[PDB]
Amino acid sequence: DCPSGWSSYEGHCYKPFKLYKTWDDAERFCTEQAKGGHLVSIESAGEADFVAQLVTENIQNTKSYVWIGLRVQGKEKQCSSEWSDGSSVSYENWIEAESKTCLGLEKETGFRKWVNIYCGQQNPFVCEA
Amino acid sequence: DCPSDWSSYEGHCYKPFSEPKNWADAENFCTQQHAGGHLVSFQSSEEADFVVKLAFQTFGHSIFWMGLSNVWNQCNWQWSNAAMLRYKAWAEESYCVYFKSTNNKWRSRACRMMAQFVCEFQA
Amino acid sequence: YNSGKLEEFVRGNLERECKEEKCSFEEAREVFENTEKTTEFWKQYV
Ligand SMILES: [Ca+2]
Ligand SMILES: [Ca+2]
Ligand SMILES: [Ca+2]
Ligand SMILES: [Ca+2]
Ligand SMILES: [Ca+2]
Ligand SMILES: [Ca+2]
Ligand SMILES: [Ca+2]
Ligand SMILES: [Ca+2]
Ligand SMILES: [Ca+2]
Ligand SMILES: [Ca+2]
């Protein structure tokens, strides 16, 4: 019930890509690989195990992360965060790459842990439909 | 005139410590070094300029906690396919802000990890 | 490679952190403090 190249798991189709893209480009690319396509959404431990296996069999890098579809929607650098002294945050000097509001799977943690990483990174990914 | 072990700037007192602590411990320790004390807060680029220098002159190149914690915990995290966020598998529970003594750029580090720090209070 | 102790207190270094040890995107970026350089370094790194 899935296109050739894709793998089926509990009603959905999954496909890993060894392409190096930013989170934005990856998400967009997925929306184009199939109707209703998106970066993978890991909603249960079982699906996490299925995806980890899919990644281990089609990525193998020992480096770089694998994008998943969970990230901070807004464009803020920090949310509802106030200085410990009690004052509001107005002035800020974040390095864009230090604002790790995207998530990726990584080899060291068996591709089953979501690691906070910079969205502008260029990594492989997994699409889901 | 800030305590002998501190440094003054714009009516405030600042002091960098070498004892390594995670974010929470650092902040609590600061509230115990003098009344109204907390982890250093950068409300302006001028203040940050002062602190970075003070920190580097004292201990040189290192990393120091700033008064910001759990920076993304209450952000609007959402799946791109709009699935509800229930199951979770975070590698780290929360991130805190710090600075590297070579410049005033803001950086993130897991709050459970260690770093040096700078306390501050209004004179 | 981050052992998770006090090593990140020391100035980054490609040899110590990326050659003698396996390093992440961010560890390399901490040395270059420039994104394009890191991404680049990454292509030829993996
Ligand atoms: Ca899913
Ligand atoms: Ca302040
Ligand atoms: Ca190391
Ligand atoms: Ca390192
Ligand atoms: Ca480093
Ligand atoms: Ca060597
Ligand atoms: Ca080593
Ligand atoms: Ca680091
Ligand atoms: Ca960093
Ligand atoms: Ca280039």
Query: Mind giving me the DSSP string for B7-52?
Result: EEETTEEEEEEEEEE-HHHHHHHHTTSSTT-EE---SSHHHHHHHH
Alpha-carbon gap, residue C41 to C32, rounded angstroms:
10
Q: How many angstroms separate the first and last alpha carbons of chain A?
A: 11
Neighbours of ion ligand 5 (CB under 5 A): C 12, 27, 30
Alpha-carbon gap, residue A89 to C10, rounded angstroms:
29
C-alpha closest to that of A36 among A16, A12, A54: A12
Q: Which ligand is nearest to the CA of B82?
A: 1
Q: Which ligand is nearest to the CA of B67?
A: 2
Using DSSP bridges, classify how beta strands B95-100 and B63-65 pair: parallel, antiparallel or unpaired. Answer: antiparallel
The answer to whether A46 and A10 are in contact (CB under 8 A) is yes
Q: How far is C12 from chain B, CA to nearest CA, in Å? A: 10
The answer to whether A107 and A101 are in contact (CB under 8 A) is no
- Measure B117 CA to ligand 1 centroid, in angstroms: 42
The answer to whether A117 and A103 are in contact (CB under 8 A) is yes
The answer to whether A75 and A99 are in contact (CB under 8 A) is no
For B20, name the nearest residue in chain C, comparing CA atoms only.
C6
C-alpha closest to that of B41 among A125, C1, A92: A92
The answer to whether A85 and B34 are in contact (CB under 8 A) is no
Phi (first) and psi of residue B38, to 5 degrees: -155, 175
Compute the residue count for chain B: 123
Residue type, B44: S
Coil/strand/helix, residue C14: helix
- Measure C9 CA to ligand 2 centroid, in angstroms: 23
C-alpha R_g of chain C: 10
Residues paired with B116 in a beta bridge = B64
For A22, name the nearest residue in chain C, comparing CA atoms only.
C39
Per DSSP, which regions of chain A are E strands?
7-9, 12-21, 38-39, 66-72, 102-105, 115-117, 123-128
Domain boundaries, chain A: 1-129
Domain boundaries, chain B: 1-123
Q: Does domain A1-129 have CATH number 3.10.100.10?
A: yes
**The two three-digit tokens of residue A25, written as one number:** 């480009």
- The CATH homologous superfamily of the domain defined by B1-123: Mannose-Binding Protein A, subunit A (3.10.100.10)
Phi (first) and psi of residue A45, to 5 degrees: -65, -35
* Resolution, Å (one decimal): 1.8
Inter-chain CB proximity C10 and B61 less than 8 Å: yes
Establish if C11 touches chain B: CB-CB under 8 angstroms. Answer: yes
Sign of CA dihedral A66, A70, A76, A80: negative
